[PDB]
Nucleic acid binder design. Structure first.
Ligand SMILES: C[C@H](CCC(=O)NCCC[N+](C)(C)C[C@H](O)CS(=O)(=O)O)[C@H]1CC[C@H]2[C@@H]3[C@H](O)C[C@@H]4C[C@H](O)CC[C@]4(C)[C@H]3C[C@H](O)[C@]12C
Ligand SMILES: Nc1ncnc2c1ncn2[C@@H]1O[C@H](COP(=O)(O)OP(=O)(O)O)[C@@H](O)[C@H]1O
Ligand SMILES: [Mg+2]
Ligand SMILES: [Zn+2]
Ligand SMILES: [Zn+2]
Ligand SMILES: [Zn+2]
Lengths: 186, 75, 590, 185
RNA sequence: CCCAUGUUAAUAGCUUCUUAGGAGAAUGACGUAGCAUGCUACGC
RNA sequence: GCGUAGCAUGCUACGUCAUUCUCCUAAGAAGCUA
């Protein structure tokens, strides 16, 4: 607006109007100068409101461009995170037993519920009280899913390690149940 | 209001115990939660006060977590 | 960003802008501070600069508030009102504020350049929040004085452990010791990048500056060195936690049949139990640092943090604990940087042990049950504030003596600081008297006590020893050479070297000289362990070789001399420089 | 509203009011109507600017207050909650809560949850002999406004102790703090 | 002419409030063009 | 009587400025219900 020539035209028309007010020309000339000042002010109004609308729109387009760039960068970051998650879960497979059971299926499909039950190497048993502990995994080896498991650790609900010499009927009150016994496939 | 000041002091007292990280000790947090829920569902003020004694005595049991001689001084 | 006014603790939002620490100030107090001094910049939640497009008016007496911004006199909108008006600079919480009168002291604290003698006596008899602010601004001034030192540049690399340095022209040389770490640069076109944290020491032969480094980089010609400056952390905790005389012992459980050695100290242990903080004052070698271990052995269930400002004071405490206390339940804390080597026999950096040991600057935020701050003479109110911010505990025992040598106070050059201004606690021991007092020299031979109970402590010491006939003090002038600022005296090292072939039992003696550089340079002629007088405070030795280097105001300081000669357990050789002091003591002549 | 445009609108309104009070005529009357109108529209544009500015100032005051108070409340949450709790505990004025608090000030705190059942076990530490004298009598033990029967008193060195050793004179030979195991009556 | 130090929170509905954008309307005001008639200065 | 010029008043169109209303959308805070 200010750098536009319309501002210069309005400013010089205002200067001419002040000079004619101080100069006392004829009333028809004064009406003429008021007319020229008014059309200069109308052109200034048009161009200045035009540039204000223009710069509002340009700032809007810049803001939406920022939003698009942020969305696309976050999409790239989420695709990277999903891909690395899938590839770590690939490296965590137990490929010998998994290949054995998949090649033992007549179609190549096995239900998902028996993928861990025949290929997992670690069994986590969660035990709520002592009678359950006595019945499911008494001693340092036990049986579940037709294999034999060897107890490698027992933690309590507080993630504290609990020795197997602790879990007795008289020390059952002082343990923070449930107990999470982690066993390995023998 | 005497019944409904113990029902609100249980709320404040369990909030204090939870901020002192009681809940990292699961056997203690189970008893504190059970005392809180028993006070809130209580109709007789005597049993509410006995459960409030038992619950507050968890807070007094831990030595340096509070500063009882400073908090009680202002009263 | 609201806060509390320093000198009346009202709520406020202003901050003085010319003060180095930006103290929060209430409205009336900020008007008093900006109407008297030349501190005319104020910051609210936004600064009080003129928000013209281009204008530089910051003087708060000039600005006006208009619309939602502060404009100078020549850009104000006609809806505006002056800030610095009615006696109150406008900030938040304007009408809920209490004026004060200490703005005749806060100005002097915040304005002075800390060089005269009076500024430290004003920084230590004001109120507590002003004590913290004064300590903080003193630390900041001491930090920004280090920017006035010169800048180094390599001329050549004589050897991989021997640089050659040229310093900036017109700017004073820093002193070369492991306190002051430098950073390297290779800034030419091409990598204006730090190339390692180095530290220097002036090698004996030639103008060689033997440098130690963190990294393993080869140094070129163009590599140049800038001193590092540490930002002062703001401080909050009071210097002295308020005392509360208890009725009976709390938190401490005494013991059955403690020992036959600490049996005469039982009353002071009960007094430590009864109070909140207690202060112990004794002349040197009279059981003060021993008393702390006796406090350990009288309250065995009490977790204790021992602290001091040096590292040799805390190492003396560490040795005494090694002799007495169980070594499994003890510790020691060393900072990660650690330019100096410390005591390594406890399980280092395990703060959970029942008896932690530390330097006051490197304390971890923990609790205790009684905390023992040894050597309060070397402590400033910044140190006591830090030990009150980190360590939360039930009892405090401040042990030390004012007549030993203080914190150095590098800025202080015009005047002398009496003991009762060293910090708050030394003031307390010189205002109302110490809570516990033990004077009887159980360490030094009676000759040392006979000459040191006439200089400082006016005939108040008797020793549990006799004249041990191994106290020799000679008078040799010692023509001096000058290092950076710490002079070095070759011929006195010469006479000491003569006193090492001709006295064989003394080869375990420790060298003591008032200057750090001579302490480094007499290791390469003699080979004895070396210790400076300022850092020797609190640890004793069997034989001590003291060498007065120069006749000045520093090495002829009677407190420095006292803490120099009261560390010899059985024998001492003192190569003097001043005539009167050599006549003041009464040794053999030699 | 006291604005520069209000000065201009004021003088124009005064001139038009006086000239229409005379009310003579006619072309200068229209000229004065036009001058008054344009000055008034300038004033109303400026008053709209003032209203927008004061509305933005008002939202700034409200949003700054909300942010300051909310962050202050979320900072001091531990100390405010503990002070609130002990205010509420003093307000109840129960005679059991007061007793266990007045013991816990001195140092006589329980080592477990206080039980409710008849004949269950409570272990409270007693730090000094006077705290023993205030709570124990013979072998009864008055705690939490309930009577407890002492079973067993151990020392800090975990040695059992008989209740006849606890004397006004033998107590310095004890190893405080005792741990009293008692059972509810 | 100098000495000590770095610590987990779903789907959906309704409602209140605040802010921003746009459109439309309504009124008022200014300016430009066009028209209606009147008046006046000149020519016929 | 007409044409030209100017002035007044009224209407219509367009450009702008303020006030009010309605709505549509966006964003946020909150509450209740299953
Ligand atoms: C215009 C308004 C009052 C004018 C008035 O009515 N005076 C009348 C006289 C009464 N007295 C006592 C003020 C004198 C003044 C008074 C308090 C000012 C706010 C805060 O300071 C700072 C804050 C942060 C940023 O800096 C800018 C925004 C904020 C919200 C400010 C806005 C504006 O700047 C306020 C509302
Ligand atoms: N009760 C005592 N009886 C005999 N000798 C003691 C006694 N207490 C301390 N000492 C000896 O006096 C010396 C004082 O050492 P220290 O406590 O470090 O003094 P300071 O604190 O003044 O440095 C110790 O070396 C110790 O051997
Ligand atoms: Mg000592
Ligand atoms: Zn200032
Ligand atoms: Zn103030
Ligand atoms: Zn300006």
């Amino acid at each position: 607006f200010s750098s536009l020539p319309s501002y210069a035209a309005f400013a010089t028309a205002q200067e001419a109007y002040e000079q004619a007010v101080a100069n006392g020309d004829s009333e028809v000339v004064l009406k003429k100068l008021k007319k020229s000042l008014n059309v200069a002010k109308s052109e200034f109004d048009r161009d200045a409101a035009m540039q204000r609308k223009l710069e509002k729109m340009a700032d809007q387009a810049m803001t939406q461009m920022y939003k698009q760039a942020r969305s696309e960068d976050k999409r790239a970051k989420v695709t990277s995170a999903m891909q690395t998650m899938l590839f770590t879960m690939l490296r965590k497979l137990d490929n010998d037993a998994l290949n054995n059971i998949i090649n033992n299926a007549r179609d190549g499909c096995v239900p998902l519920n028996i993928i861990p039950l025949t290929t997992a190497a670690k069994l986590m048993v969660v035990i709520p009280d002592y009678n359950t502990y006595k019945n499911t995994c008494d001693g340092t080896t036990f049986t579940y899913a037709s294999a034999l498991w060897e107890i490698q650790q027992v933690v309590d609900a507080d993630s504290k390690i609990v020795q197997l010499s602790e879990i007795s009927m008289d020390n059952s009150p002082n343990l923070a149940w449930p107990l999470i016994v982690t066993a390995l496939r023998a | 209001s005497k019944m409904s000041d113990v029902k609100c002091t249980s709320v404040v007292l369990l909030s204090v115990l939870q901020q002192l990280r009681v809940e990292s000790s699961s056997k203690l947090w189970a008893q504190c939660v059970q005392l809180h829920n028993d006070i809130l569902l209580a109709k007789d003020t005597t049993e509410a006060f006995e459960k409030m004694v038992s619950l507050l005595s968890v807070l007094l049991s831990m030595q340096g977590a509070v500063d009882i001689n400073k908090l009680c001084e202002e009263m | 960003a609201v806060g509390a006014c320093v000198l009346c603790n009202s709520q406020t939002s202003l901050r003085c802008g010319a003060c180095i620490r930006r103290p929060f100030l209430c409205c009336k107090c900020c008007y008093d501070h900006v109407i008297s001094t030349s501190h005319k910049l104020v910051l609210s939640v936004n600064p009080y600069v003129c928000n013209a497009p281009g204008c530089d008016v910051t003087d708060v007496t000039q600005l006006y508030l208009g619309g939602m911004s502060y404009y100078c006199k020549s850009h104000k909108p006609p809806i505006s009102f002056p800030l610095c008006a009615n006696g109150q600079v406008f900030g938040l919480y304007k009408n809920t504020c209490v004026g004060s009168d200490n703005v005749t002291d806060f100005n002097a604290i915040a304005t002075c350049d800390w060089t005269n003698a009076g500024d430290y006596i004003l920084a230590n008899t004001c109120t507590e929040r002003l004590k913290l602010f004064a300590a903080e601004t003193l630390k900041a001034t001491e930090e920004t004085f280090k920017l006035s030192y010169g800048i180094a540049t390599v001329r050549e690399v004589l050897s991989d452990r021997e640089l050659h340095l040229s310093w900036e022209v017109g700017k004073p040389r820093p002193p070369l010791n492991r306190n002051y770490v430098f950073t390297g640069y290779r800034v030419t076109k091409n990598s204006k990048v730090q190339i390692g944290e180095y530290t220097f020491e002036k090698g004996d032969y030639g103008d060689a500056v033997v440098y130690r480094g963190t990294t393993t980089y080869k140094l070129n010609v163009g590599d140049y060195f800038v001193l590092t400056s540490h930002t002062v952390m703001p401080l909050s905790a009071p210097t002295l936690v308020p005392q509360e005389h208890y009725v009976r012992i709390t938190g401490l459980y005494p013991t059955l049949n403690i020992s036959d050695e600490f049996s005469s100290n039982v009353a002071n242990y009960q007094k430590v139990g009864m109070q909140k903080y207690s202060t112990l004052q004794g002349p040197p070698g009279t059981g003060k640092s021993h008393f702390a271990i006796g406090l350990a052995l009288y309250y065995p269930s009490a977790r204790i943090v021992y602290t001091a400002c040096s590292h040799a004071a805390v190492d003396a405490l560490c040795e005494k604990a090694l002799k007495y206390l169980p070594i499994d339940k003890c510790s020691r804390i060393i900072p990660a940087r650690a330019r100096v080597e410390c005591f390594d026999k406890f399980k280092v950096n395990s703060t959970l042990e029942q008896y932690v040991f530390c330097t006051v600057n490197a304390l971890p935020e923990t609790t205790a049950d009684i905390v023992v701050f040894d050597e309060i003479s070397m402590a400033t109110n910044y140190d006591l504030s830090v030990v009150n911010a980190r360590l939360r505990a039930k009892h405090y025992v401040y042990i030390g003596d004012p007549a030993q040598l203080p914190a150095p106070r590098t800025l202080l050059t015009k005047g002398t600081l009496e003991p009762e201004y060293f910090n708050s606690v030394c003031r307390l021991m010189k205002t109302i008297g110490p809570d516990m007092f033990l004077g009887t020299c159980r360490r030094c031979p009676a000759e040392i006590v006979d000459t040191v109970s006439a200089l400082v402590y006016d005939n108040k010491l008797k020793a549990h020893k006799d004249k041990s006939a191994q106290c020799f003090k000679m008078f040799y002038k010692g023509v001096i050479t000058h290092d950076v600022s710490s002079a070095i005296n070759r011929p006195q090292i010469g006479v000491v070297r003569e006193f090492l072939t001709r006295n064989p039992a003394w080869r375990k003696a420790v060298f003591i000289s008032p200057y750090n550089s001579q302490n480094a340079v007499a290791s390469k002629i003699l080979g004895l362990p070396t210790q400076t007088v300022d850092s020797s405070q609190g640890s004793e030795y069997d034989y001590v070789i003291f060498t007065q280097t120069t006749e000045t105001a520093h090495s002829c300081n009677v407190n420095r001399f006292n803490v120099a000669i009261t560390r010899a357990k059985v024998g001492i050789l003192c190569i003097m420089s001043d005539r009167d002091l050599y006549d003041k003591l009464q040794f053999t002549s030699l």
